[PDB]
Amino acid sequence: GAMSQIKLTPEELRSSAQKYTAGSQQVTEVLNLLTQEQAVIDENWDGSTFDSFEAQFNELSPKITEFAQLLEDINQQLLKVADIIEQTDADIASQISG
Amino acid sequence: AMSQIKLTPEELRSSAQKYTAGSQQVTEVLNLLTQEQAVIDENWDGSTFDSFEAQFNELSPKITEFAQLLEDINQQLLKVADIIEQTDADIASQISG
């Protein structure tokens, strides 16, 4: 099971996790910023010139939100797994006598 | 249809900069974490992480498309700013001359 299958240490799992949460946050910020820019362009440039970019942005936008959410979910899984593994090491050290 | 475009060339260019910067940032995150997904895959035997792998893989091409869209918007904003800037110059010269 996992104790056999996982080769990353708790520390390695935590270092990987940090990359995912930082990327989640960065993606969210980009999307939030450019959502505002899209609205500014829409309001301050009358007509249909950017209608196709508007539709494409709006179609992709929820995928970007999902991606940010996925990256954060992965951070949480890796942190939780790291804690379970670290406690396993401690429990073997305390409970096993060999 | 009004002809008026309320954003000035300078304003259009400031917005374009945000699109291309955002594009780069999204691509960097996808690059870094594509590589980290392969680390996890190689260092976690079996199928336990398979769903997170599938979820990442399904979204990845959309992320690449998004980053390209952002670059495309940048490019067209710069093009429109240049058209407007010439027009502004031609009107200013016409009125002053």
From Swiss-Prot, chain B:
UniProt signal peptide: none
SUPFAM superfamilies: EsxAB dimer-like
Lineage: superkingdom: Bacteria
Pfam families assigned: WXG100
Listed InterPro entries: ESAT-6-like_sf, T7SS_ESAT-6-like
Disulfide linkage: none
Subunit structure: Homodimer.
Family: Belongs to the WXG100 family. sagEsxA-like subfamily.
Protein name: ESAT-6-like protein SAG1039
